[model samples]
Target: MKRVFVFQDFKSQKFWSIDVRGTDVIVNYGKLGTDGQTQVKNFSSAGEAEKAAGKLIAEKTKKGYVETLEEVAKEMKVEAKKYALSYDEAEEGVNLMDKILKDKKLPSLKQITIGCWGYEGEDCSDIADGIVENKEKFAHFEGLFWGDIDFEEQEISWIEQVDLSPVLDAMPLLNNLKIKGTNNLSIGKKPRPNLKSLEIISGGLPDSVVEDILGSDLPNLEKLVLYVGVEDYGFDGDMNVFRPLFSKDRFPNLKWLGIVDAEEQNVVVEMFLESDILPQLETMDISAGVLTDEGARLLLDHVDKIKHLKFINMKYNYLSDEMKKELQKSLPMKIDVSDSQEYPMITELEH
Candidate 1:
């Protein structure tokens, strides 16, 4: 049997072990969820357990899993318990562990998903700017929607959003990027040659930004997620704002095109079908601002090609009982439409 050892509360000086033999490791983590006292299983031969344990310690450290100062000390204690080390020896081991994590940088993109709410502050944008400044350290980066971040630092280096140009200019090695927030960002004259994926959330993106993005030389671009609102900068008027991105040959790698909280669902549907963006698209999510039967039917017009479609935050919308029945009949993906609840989607879609 292929057994894997699981650990819990490693930062609390408490570690729980379980033998998960003949089971998929990725599936196990997905089922476990992300929270306190969660499991971290080590799957390797008995002779390699020590090395595996060390690797896990290093991985968690680099990922900033140890959120508290006390947790860091507790993690050291857990490693000492496993190896039967003295206090001094454990401290030295932890110092070495820190060095290993700091010096050891992996050559791959890292994507993080922040929910539709709860995140508020400059920390998120600051972190993105820092990453872009050190773009050589990362291959790609993505930040999911539902919060507002300020990236107004004059000129964007590597990051791409409407007003935030400084972050874009700083990223010299960025090949893919995503930003989801309530900020009106325009990339009028800015040029980003390495970007591959672009997504804008909330209702801050203007038609000028869309035109500039479509006119850019993003030959490697793939997926696009646009979530518009109605008030102020939101999309309440016409659907011509996204005409530039309606072309197929511009983005050959494009697989998913989504419009959230759109006012004119028919215009979006017609534009998508007429442009043939759905033939090569794999997924599309649409949430009519008001859940009328007509609105739902407009979305359903292209249901044949859109494999992934759902109503987001429908509790606040005007979804009638009859529309609900039609939704149930179609058996589309039932996303959490409650206003108070939070969605726990994964950061990376690789799994």
Candidate 2:
């Protein structure tokens, strides 16, 4: 017997199917619309395959996958299409988007993750255009993840991205948007009407790109994270440039703020320590930077004043052992000062 299970939400679409015949079991699993991933495993006996199937079904069910109990179900729903393209698919110009645009349920899709995108010069301009053309469908999107390619396929910074202003313009209701690359990426000039969380994990985030965000109106934005990466890659901006954002007027609803993956992590920390925004944030992540004890000392002095702040993330720093231990004891709120390094710590997601 063959069994099919499905999981879907505003931010994700996944499916798992298992087919058993004799001692061979075939499994196909991935996001909806696309053919997805395929795997086959052989067991010594039919009993073994049956047992494996039983175990697999139970495991998937707890993760919110629903199994079909009755007959006549669509092999896949049109909620979202995945394009984790292989070399062959990318060369063939494979893009499974036409059906999604016409789907009645298009407007309700919550998550869209693209992978190994060479659909338009590995930057995903073509796929981005598709989303823009069908902006009506994604008018209510809550989450969008671009360049979901594996590191084995392409590094986060290596994967090129295009001007994404059109996408942001289209999806007014977007709450969360996480992009991997910053090259040729744009969030547009107009104000984001309802963005809450934004993260761009890149090797080098340009000043102009950030200026675009700073100039834009994101009054309701609650979380802001940028990988202020190394100068060798693309990041070359003064700390003073970000001072405008520290103003209480900018990002008034800001709560979770992170300036991660910086060569000058300590400098960023120093600027934030004295900023007005620190008192308002609930979570501050300064991890994946070259944070020495000096930055920790600054935090040690002033971090206590941010009464509402709760979590301080300073992982992946080059702090002295004693300082690390000191932070663990001194900080009143929940703090993460793990991953001490002697050499230097920079970025977690950048190449």
Candidate 3:
């Protein structure tokens, strides 16, 4: 028996394979495009070899590796490919459903990203319906990214969304969910035990949506990123709403916490510092906000507390050059203070 797995992210892309024959297990792994290195091991019995192979597979899968890949893996490097419908093409009847349903790799695909549905201020309810209708095609999917619309296609605030609860229910294997828009969005009122990462990016996350997330039951969530945009677009809730998220037992596995892209980033910074989630978090992502020198100093003052953090993402902030340099030199963790903003505008989805 032979099995293959692939892993991809912002930094690297790689593949791993295991072939078992009698008491011998042959392993191969390397970068996506390369031939990769190989190793061979012999067990005392065929059962032992199979068990060893299973252990290896479990380890890789836990680290975000997925099984099988078709021709689509050659063109794109990532496990999840963004499938979008352009406004002009959609207007001309280039259906997103037809294109995705016709894909040969749909069965084996572990992750799927739905990008721009159209630029005519359209909602993604239809797309959500289409996905639920053909849920069997996505039986293997462990990740789903809905509403991946960029600012160029349509303002994030204008990207009307829908209740994606049905879509979540259909894809039982889905563990990673990333949604871009929040207008009329509902994450459903169900318990998602399988979900590991939940990221919502918006210009202004609505009060209802914040409540939805607060009410969501994701016991195994390892990463949580909420882009709490300004009040003009939709954000109405204050820091009080998010105070519940800091409850240590709410998300026991959460390691990456990003409550970023807000107008009142300094307040958020203070809130996070006061929270109990800091100890377990490997990465503190207070980026894409209006974090100034004062906020930067807050992080510096607590350097002893945050030194355990592996990474601090402070990209797209309002920090001055002097503070930026000071943070770079002072923080022991790997920090990113790049793309310092001139003003206090939402760096992401600025409508």
Instruction: Report every candidate's CA lDDT.
Output: 0.45, 0.76, 0.82
Model 2 alpha-carbon miss at residue 154, Å:
1.8
* True-structure lDDT of candidate 3: 0.82
Residue-level error in angstroms, candidate 1, position 55: 29
- List the candidates ranked by lDDT, beginning with the highest: 3, 2, 1
> lDDT: which is higher, 2 or 3?
3
Per-residue lDDT tens digits for candidate 3, residues 288-316, read 88788899899989887788999989888
* Model 1 per-residue lDDT tens digits across residues 163-205: 4455555554445455544345554445565666676655534
Tens-place lDDT per residue, model 2, 1-351, is 778888876446667888898998889887666678889999999999989988888999977889863242345555554446667764676554554465566554566666665534556776789889977777877777777767777665677888888888887777888887777777776788578888888778888778888878988889888888767677785656666777568888899888888877888777677788888889888898888899888888875665457888888888898988888888888888887667635565543
Best by TM-score: 3
Of 1 and 3, the candidate ahead on lDDT is 3
Clashes of each: 21, 2, 0
C-alpha TM-score for every candidate: 0.51, 0.74, 0.77
Error of 3 at 213 (Å): 1.5
